[PDB]
Amino acid sequence: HMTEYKLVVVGAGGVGKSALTIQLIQNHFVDEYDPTIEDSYRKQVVIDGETCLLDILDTAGQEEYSAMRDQYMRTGEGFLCVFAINNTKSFEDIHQYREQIKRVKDSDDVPMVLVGNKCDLAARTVESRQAQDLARSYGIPYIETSAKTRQGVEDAFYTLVREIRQH
Amino acid sequence: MRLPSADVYRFAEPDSEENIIFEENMQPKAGIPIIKAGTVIKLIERLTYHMYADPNFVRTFLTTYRSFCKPQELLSLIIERFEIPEPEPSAELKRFRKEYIQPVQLRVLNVCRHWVEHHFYDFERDAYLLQRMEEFIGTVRGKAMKKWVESITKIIQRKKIAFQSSPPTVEWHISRPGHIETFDLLTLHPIEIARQLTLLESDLYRAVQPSELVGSVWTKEDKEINSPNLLKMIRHTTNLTLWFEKCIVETENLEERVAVVSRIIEILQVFQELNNFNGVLEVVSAMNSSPVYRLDHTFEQIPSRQKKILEEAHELSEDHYKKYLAKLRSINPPCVPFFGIYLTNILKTEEGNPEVLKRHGKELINFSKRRKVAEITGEIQQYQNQPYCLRVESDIKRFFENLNPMGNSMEKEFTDYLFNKSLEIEPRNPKPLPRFPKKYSYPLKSPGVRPSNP
Ligand SMILES: Nc1ccc(S(=O)(=O)N2CCCCC2=O)cc1
């Protein structure tokens, strides 16, 4: 069988976090998503010559169920920690998301990427250097993505698979 | 038919690829085409179509129109639709009045009636919208319309003013009726804890309206204004999960903690039998939490039957809720679904599909996206109709409504307290297992989950 990677998207609600996985799964060119089917969260990809399947969990909309997160944090193999570049509180929330994941995994070395998402035309409040400094203090990569153009989306998920592979 | 010109009546402009598009299939039971997209004028024309009634489209349109059309703009458009001029000049005028004017005017009143009956909150939130509706309904003249005009006035006035055999006997264990001061996880009867929480959770589930969900409003900055019932339902769930975790880790004596965990799995069994999936997942989330999941000495002592009950319950959420979904589909009401799945599906449907479609450079409202949202809200509504045949015990209810495990602590401080309690009661290896004194003066033996009387 080809390797299956269980990926988990974590981050603040209300700031377009769902666009990351939606854009990955959409071929680009097609704007017609059904979240009720397997193909909406399972994607066969080829990364550095090696074929694999990405099984992505994104519970966007369920952030108020704050006592239900430990389950997916325990099963997930890699985490995309997402904040919106126009929302400082979403950036400041990353620290606790990472602390929970570490606690649940019982480890300081968990495959993880920091993702800065440009979710709309509004003004940037988190500079790339602040986000790069935070990512370096955690020992993880930083990737900026655009929700409108799909730029960086592939790189955010592929970099995470490389972190799992190199763990 | 010879309809008037577009310059005198906007809804007479003929259909084209530039103003209306359809899905390939027909409405399953009606044989009616499914609208994929259209200009608002074409959507209003089809909302009040002369050739036939379209209740599915009317229902969907009224549940979801606010993302592309304001309530004040809709009322104008349906009033404009009702004011049909006669074509520029008999046999033509007699058939036009009976096959176009009369049916369109009657479909407008049907939209007004359904609007006031099922989406009265638009009128409650905007008193001037109700003024204009009452004015317009007062101007309607005709014996044909009179009956429908009177029905709308009765719904308005009522909206402004604002059944089984015997339920099972209430179960009691250590705590007796009225001894509210001793009510707790182990002293209340496990059957009755589950019944009362299912009643509470059923009512919280039933109070959630589509106005709290359409447009993903529970995730936006005004969520506390627009989705209060949804957020009360989610907060109760979270609170019960934290209460179960707190009951466990604050029971420092191992034997007592085994009795606590075992009692919660018995509550889970009753939740499973009542089809309270929200309650099942409250328990599963507590068992899967960081403080509880690591209590190996506690789980070692749990009887096999209860380990298997918990394991089948844990399996419901695996693989994107695959087993949960199959099970919810297989059962019939009464039930308490897990709301979270619907929230993600509504949100991802709204964020993953475009608001507008473009055909020959013209913007068409993507109606199919709205229909997908209305199908999720319709599925939610299907489970809110059937109540439980269980009696309310006012004091147990009040006990569960007023639970506050966190107290005055913030979320981080409290979950850090639970985890550090877990570490104290069962230290990480190779620290030895300490012993702790017992805290419960009453017996730990459960009465079981089989009802005590016929
Ligand atoms: N990517 C992924 C991560 C976690 C999982 S799960 O089976 O743990 N799970 C538990 C939480 C709710 C949904 C779910 O599927 C599956 C795929």
PDB file of N, CA and C in Angstrom, chain B residues 24 65 90 92 111 133 140 150 160 189 207 223 235 262 268 281 293 303 314 325 328 368 371 405 428 443 454:
ATOM      1  N   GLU B  24     -28.871  19.573 -14.475  1.00  0.00           N
ATOM      2  CA  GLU B  24     -29.343  18.573 -15.453  1.00  0.00           C
ATOM      3  C   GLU B  24     -30.580  17.760 -14.982  1.00  0.00           C
ATOM      4  N   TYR B  65     -31.994  33.521   1.211  1.00  0.00           N
ATOM      5  CA  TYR B  65     -31.847  34.688   0.344  1.00  0.00           C
ATOM      6  C   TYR B  65     -31.002  35.841   0.888  1.00  0.00           C
ATOM      7  N   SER B  90     -61.320  41.378 -24.188  1.00  0.00           N
ATOM      8  CA  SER B  90     -60.871  40.632 -25.367  1.00  0.00           C
ATOM      9  C   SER B  90     -60.371  39.225 -24.991  1.00  0.00           C
ATOM     10  N   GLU B  92     -57.319  37.952 -25.563  1.00  0.00           N
ATOM     11  CA  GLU B  92     -55.959  38.050 -25.025  1.00  0.00           C
ATOM     12  C   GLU B  92     -55.999  38.518 -23.564  1.00  0.00           C
ATOM     13  N   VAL B 111     -45.679  33.366  -1.007  1.00  0.00           N
ATOM     14  CA  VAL B 111     -44.336  33.758  -0.551  1.00  0.00           C
ATOM     15  C   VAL B 111     -44.494  34.626   0.737  1.00  0.00           C
ATOM     16  N   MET B 133     -45.263  45.371   4.845  1.00  0.00           N
ATOM     17  CA  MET B 133     -45.948  44.103   4.544  1.00  0.00           C
ATOM     18  C   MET B 133     -47.437  44.289   4.833  1.00  0.00           C
ATOM     19  N   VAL B 140     -54.284  44.760  -1.237  1.00  0.00           N
ATOM     20  CA  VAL B 140     -54.689  43.637  -2.086  1.00  0.00           C
ATOM     21  C   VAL B 140     -56.220  43.575  -2.146  1.00  0.00           C
ATOM     22  N   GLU B 150     -56.466  37.220   4.361  1.00  0.00           N
ATOM     23  CA  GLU B 150     -56.944  37.060   5.743  1.00  0.00           C
ATOM     24  C   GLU B 150     -56.069  36.111   6.521  1.00  0.00           C
ATOM     25  N   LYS B 160     -47.016  38.488  16.282  1.00  0.00           N
ATOM     26  CA  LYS B 160     -46.784  39.690  17.091  1.00  0.00           C
ATOM     27  C   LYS B 160     -47.117  39.438  18.577  1.00  0.00           C
ATOM     28  N   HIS B 189     -28.959   8.521  40.268  1.00  0.00           N
ATOM     29  CA  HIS B 189     -29.023   7.232  39.578  1.00  0.00           C
ATOM     30  C   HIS B 189     -28.434   7.388  38.156  1.00  0.00           C
ATOM     31  N   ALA B 207     -33.947  24.031  19.963  1.00  0.00           N
ATOM     32  CA  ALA B 207     -34.030  25.487  19.960  1.00  0.00           C
ATOM     33  C   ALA B 207     -33.138  26.127  18.913  1.00  0.00           C
ATOM     34  N   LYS B 223     -21.395  36.440  16.579  1.00  0.00           N
ATOM     35  CA  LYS B 223     -21.926  35.123  16.931  1.00  0.00           C
ATOM     36  C   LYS B 223     -22.808  35.089  18.186  1.00  0.00           C
ATOM     37  N   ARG B 235     -21.788  25.053  24.489  1.00  0.00           N
ATOM     38  CA  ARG B 235     -21.239  25.319  25.817  1.00  0.00           C
ATOM     39  C   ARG B 235     -21.675  24.338  26.856  1.00  0.00           C
ATOM     40  N   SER B 262     -16.308   3.988  35.724  1.00  0.00           N
ATOM     41  CA  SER B 262     -17.275   2.912  35.472  1.00  0.00           C
ATOM     42  C   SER B 262     -18.701   3.475  35.420  1.00  0.00           C
ATOM     43  N   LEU B 268     -22.960   6.554  29.590  1.00  0.00           N
ATOM     44  CA  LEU B 268     -22.745   6.456  28.144  1.00  0.00           C
ATOM     45  C   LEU B 268     -23.647   5.371  27.507  1.00  0.00           C
ATOM     46  N   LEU B 281     -20.837  11.428  22.725  1.00  0.00           N
ATOM     47  CA  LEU B 281     -19.595  12.105  22.391  1.00  0.00           C
ATOM     48  C   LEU B 281     -19.059  13.001  23.522  1.00  0.00           C
ATOM     49  N   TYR B 293      -7.098  10.138  29.471  1.00  0.00           N
ATOM     50  CA  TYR B 293      -6.552   9.132  28.560  1.00  0.00           C
ATOM     51  C   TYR B 293      -5.339   8.412  29.100  1.00  0.00           C
ATOM     52  N   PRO B 303     -13.997  -3.207  34.187  1.00  0.00           N
ATOM     53  CA  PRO B 303     -14.468  -4.493  33.637  1.00  0.00           C
ATOM     54  C   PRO B 303     -14.532  -4.499  32.115  1.00  0.00           C
ATOM     55  N   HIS B 314     -16.052   5.071  21.015  1.00  0.00           N
ATOM     56  CA  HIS B 314     -14.866   5.761  20.478  1.00  0.00           C
ATOM     57  C   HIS B 314     -14.775   5.604  18.951  1.00  0.00           C
ATOM     58  N   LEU B 325     -22.131   8.549  11.377  1.00  0.00           N
ATOM     59  CA  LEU B 325     -23.053   8.952  10.295  1.00  0.00           C
ATOM     60  C   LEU B 325     -23.976   7.817   9.855  1.00  0.00           C
ATOM     61  N   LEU B 328     -26.489   7.325  12.781  1.00  0.00           N
ATOM     62  CA  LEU B 328     -27.521   8.372  12.807  1.00  0.00           C
ATOM     63  C   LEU B 328     -28.535   8.099  11.671  1.00  0.00           C
ATOM     64  N   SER B 368     -27.561  27.003  -6.274  1.00  0.00           N
ATOM     65  CA  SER B 368     -27.198  25.627  -5.902  1.00  0.00           C
ATOM     66  C   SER B 368     -26.397  25.511  -4.613  1.00  0.00           C
ATOM     67  N   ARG B 371     -28.963  26.045  -1.906  1.00  0.00           N
ATOM     68  CA  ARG B 371     -29.716  24.786  -1.793  1.00  0.00           C
ATOM     69  C   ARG B 371     -28.952  23.753  -0.967  1.00  0.00           C
ATOM     70  N   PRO B 405     -17.957  23.354  36.192  1.00  0.00           N
ATOM     71  CA  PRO B 405     -16.669  22.786  36.635  1.00  0.00           C
ATOM     72  C   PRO B 405     -15.511  23.746  36.683  1.00  0.00           C
ATOM     73  N   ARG B 428       3.993  10.078  36.083  1.00  0.00           N
ATOM     74  CA  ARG B 428       4.627   9.498  34.889  1.00  0.00           C
ATOM     75  C   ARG B 428       5.642   8.464  35.337  1.00  0.00           C
ATOM     76  N   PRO B 443     -21.707   4.184  49.668  1.00  0.00           N
ATOM     77  CA  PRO B 443     -21.179   3.058  48.879  1.00  0.00           C
ATOM     78  C   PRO B 443     -20.974   3.404  47.403  1.00  0.00           C
ATOM     79  N   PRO B 454     -41.250  -1.918  36.859  1.00  0.00           N
ATOM     80  CA  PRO B 454     -41.905  -2.047  35.541  1.00  0.00           C
ATOM     81  C   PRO B 454     -42.423  -0.712  34.995  1.00  0.00           C
TER      82      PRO B 454
END
